[PDB]
Amino acid sequence: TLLKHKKITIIGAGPVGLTMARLLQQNGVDITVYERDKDQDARIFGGTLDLHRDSGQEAMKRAGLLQTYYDLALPMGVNIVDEKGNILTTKNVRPENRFDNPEINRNDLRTILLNSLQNDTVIWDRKLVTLEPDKEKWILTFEDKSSETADLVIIANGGMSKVRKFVTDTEVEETGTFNIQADIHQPEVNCPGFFQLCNGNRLMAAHQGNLLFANPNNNGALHFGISFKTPDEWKSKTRVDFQDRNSVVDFLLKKFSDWDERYKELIRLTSSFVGLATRIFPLDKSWKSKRPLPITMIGDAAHLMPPFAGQGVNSGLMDALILSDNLTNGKFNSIEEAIENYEQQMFAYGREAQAESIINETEMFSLDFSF
Ligand SMILES: Cc1cc2nc3c(=O)[nH]c(=O)nc-3n(C[C@H](O)[C@H](O)[C@H](O)COP(=O)(O)OP(=O)(O)OC[C@H]3O[C@@H](n4cnc5c(N)ncnc54)[C@H](O)[C@@H]3O)c2cc1C
Ligand SMILES: Cc1c2c(c(O)c3c(O)cccc13)C(=O)[C@]1(O)C(=O)C(C(N)=O)=C(O)[C@@H](N(C)C)[C@@H]1C2
Numbered sequence: 001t002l003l004k005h006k007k008i009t010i011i012g013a014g015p016v017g018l019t020m021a022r023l024l025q026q027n028g029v030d031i032t033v034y035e036r037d038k039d040q041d042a043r044i045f046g047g048t049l050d051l052h053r054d055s056g057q058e059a060m061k062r063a064g065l066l067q068t069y070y071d072l073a074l075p076m077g078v079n080i081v082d083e084k085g086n087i088l089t090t091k092n093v094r095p096e097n098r099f100d101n102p103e104i105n106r107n108d109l110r111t112i113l114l115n116s117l118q119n120d121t122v123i124w125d126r127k128l129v130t131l132e133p134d135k136e137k138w139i140l141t142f143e144d145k146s147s148e149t150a151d152l153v154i155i156a157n158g159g160m161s162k163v164r165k166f167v168t169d170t171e172v173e174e175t176g177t178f179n180i181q182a183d184i185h186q187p188e189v190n191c192p193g194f195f196q197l198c199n200g201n202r203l204m205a206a207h208q209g210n211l212l213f214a215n216p217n218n219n220g221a222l223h224f225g226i227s228f229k230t231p232d233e234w235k236s237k238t239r240v241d242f243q244d245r246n247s248v249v250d251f252l253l254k255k256f257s258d259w260d261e262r263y264k265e266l267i268r269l270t271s272s273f274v275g276l277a278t279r280i281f282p283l284d285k286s287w288k289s290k291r292p293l294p295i296t297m298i299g300d301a302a303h304l305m306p307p308f309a310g311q312g313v314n315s316g317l318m319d320a321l322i323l324s325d326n327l328t329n330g331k332f333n334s335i336e337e338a339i340e341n342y343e344q345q346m347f348a349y350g351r352e353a354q355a356e357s358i359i360n361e362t363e364m365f366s367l368d369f370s371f
Contacts, residue, residue, distance in 0.1 A: 002327055002335050003029050009140065009150035012157030013037070013122045015049065015106070016299030016316035018113035020154060021121060022063045023324035031117075032150070034140070036127035036157075040114060045274060046181065047215055047223045048076075048103035052314045059317035068112045073102030074217060077201035080371045083208075083259040085197055088371070092201070105219040131163045133292040152335060154323070155297040159281055159304030167297050168287040175306050175358065177278040177365055178230040180248070182270040187222035191269045193262040195222060205263075206369050210255055212263065224266065226252065227308075229365050230277060242275040249273075278306045278361065283351045287343060294335045296342060298323060303350040308360040311353040319346055 008024060010017045013035035025031040051057045051069060060066045075098040080089040114122065130141035131153065140148040155161055159172065187195040197203065198216035203224075205212045214224035233239075240251045252267045281304035299316035322345050326338035363369060 001330070002332065002338060003152075006030065006151040006335075007032070007149065008152045008154065009034060009138070009148070010154045010156050011128050011140075011161075011163065012155070012299075012301070013110070013114075014156060014158060014299060014316075015109055015113065015313050016320055017154075017156030018110065018117070018122070019059050019063060019317055020156060020298060020320035020324060022065070022113060022116050023059070023320055024327065025117060025121065026063065027324075027328045029328075031121055032148075033117075033122040034126040034128055034142070034148070035122050035124050036143075037124060039124045040110075040122070044106040044110060045183075046106055047213075047225065048074075048105055048218050049109060049313050050101040050103055050310060051317070052101055052310075055321075056314040056317045059321040062321060063113075063116060065112055065116055068116075069104060069109070070099055070102065072108045072112065073104040075099075075102045076215065076217070079199065079201045079203050081197070081203055081205045083205060083263070085260040085262055087199075090201070103215065103218075108219065128157065128163055131166065131295075133166075136293065138293055138295070152294045155295065155301045156299050157301055159279060159300035161297075161301040164297060164301065166288070166291055166295055168285065170282060170285050170287075172279050172281050172304060174230075175278045175280055175361060176230055177227055177306065177361055178234075179276055179278060179307075180226045180252070181274045181276075182224060182272065183218070184222040184224070184266070184269055186220060187216055191222060191266055194266040197262050198222075204371060205259075206364070206371055207259065208255075209365055209367050211364060214266075226255075227278075227365070228255070240275075242273060245270075245272065248275065280305050280354060280358070283347055283354060286347075291336075294339060296323065296339045298346075302346060303354060305354045305357045306361045307357070308364055309353065309357040311357055315350060315353045318349060322346065 007030050010021050010033045013033050021031045021033050060069050075093040077092040079087050081087050127143035129143050132139050137149045138153045184191045195216050203214040211227045216222045241247045298319035323342040326342050332338040
């Protein structure tokens with residue numbers, strides 16, 4: 001009854017925002033999602049996602065999509081390999097435990113979430129740029145100059161969100177590591193040496209402070225990521241330009257001098273690199289207790305954390321599960337009370353996940369790390 005005659009808008013059609021939309025919409029709520037992506041066919045860059053049984057799968061199960069997720073997800077083994085190509089350990093998948101945390105492509109996950117929403121729930125090509133209160137309505141202004149209204153706004157537009165101020169003045173901060181991600185489409189044909197090395201499993205390798213991760217089977221593409229402590233020089237004078245593939249390739253081949261040629265072939269065969277400093281949106285400071293109208297944040301917009309403990313999406317899907325339940329479960333007598341309890345709970349499991357992810361980051365990028 002809290003949401004009677006309330007227009008609820010979600011900013012961002014990521015995994016967290018769409019799951020939130022599904023959880024509210026299946027209860028009869030009036031939901032609109034504004035997404036900056038041009039249209040539903042836009043590719044989502046990055047690796048696969050694993051939904052954990054305790055958190056991410058609960059959100060999907062609660063939304064009625066758990067089996068759809070299982071149908072599209074792939075169980076993946078993991079090989080720990082040294083820099084010379086020697087497999088050190090092989091953690092294969094139990095057929096019994098294959099539904100524990102199978103990997104799903106990001107576009108496939110988005111498609112299942114979109115198909116569970118009513119038609120035209122997501123409004124595409126809508127980049128929110130301004131959010132201001134007008135009496136009892138939020139005013140949403142978009143990059144294309146259009147404007148919309150809402151009674152409740154849920155910020156779900158990712159870790160670099162610029163529309164958080166009414167909730168918190170906390171700024172995104174850097175942790176000291178750097179990630180370079182890339183895709184090699186049709187790896188059986190285009191990087192056969194490294195594809196053979198993965199041998200149907202995800203690959204993980206650490207050497208000289210440089211970590212390499214690879215998934216050979218991300219919907220017919222090999223996705224891999226290279227992570228390291230950000231060089232101290234890049235803070236004063238950096239010489240790698242990430243708009244120039246050739247400069248990125250040159251830098252990586254220097255870093256990977258001692259690695260087996262199959263790794264260097266992987267680097268030389270990459271057409272585009274995405275480089276980004278690891279960031280955190282810290283939960284050290286409490287959010288604002290005085291807000292002009294109901295608003296909150298979920299997902300990376302709430303607790304962006306380093307992606308070294310596999311907590312990112314699962315923490316966000318927990319946000320959507322707890323917040324959607326609080327708004328519909330009859331336990332609270334105001335939207336604001338329901339939001340406040342959500343944030344109390346989220347600061348608790350959010351703070352723990354961030355502390356874990358920082359612990360893993362510090363350990364993994366020490367020169368003594370060995371998996
Ligand atoms: C390199 C890397 C690897 C990772 N690996 C994993 C992993 O293996 N497992 C895992 O669980 N997590 C992983 N994560 C973290 C995980 O991807 C995030 O926690 C998760 O994607 C957060 O989802 P979200 O919906 O909150 O935000 P996002 O996934 O960023 O989605 C936000 C959405 O909002 C849209 N948007 C942004 N600004 C606007 C705007 N102004 N107006 C409208 N729409 C807007 C974006 O286009 C996007 O669709 C990784 C992160 C990184 C950087
Ligand atoms: C360290 C780690 C990683 C991942 C991960 O899921 C995870 C976990 O679930 C528990 C503990 C540790 C990790 C990744 O999935 C992954 O996203 C990944 O597979 C990966 C990749 N396939 O390229 C990465 O790039 C890695 N990172 C730099 C973002 C990260 C590494």
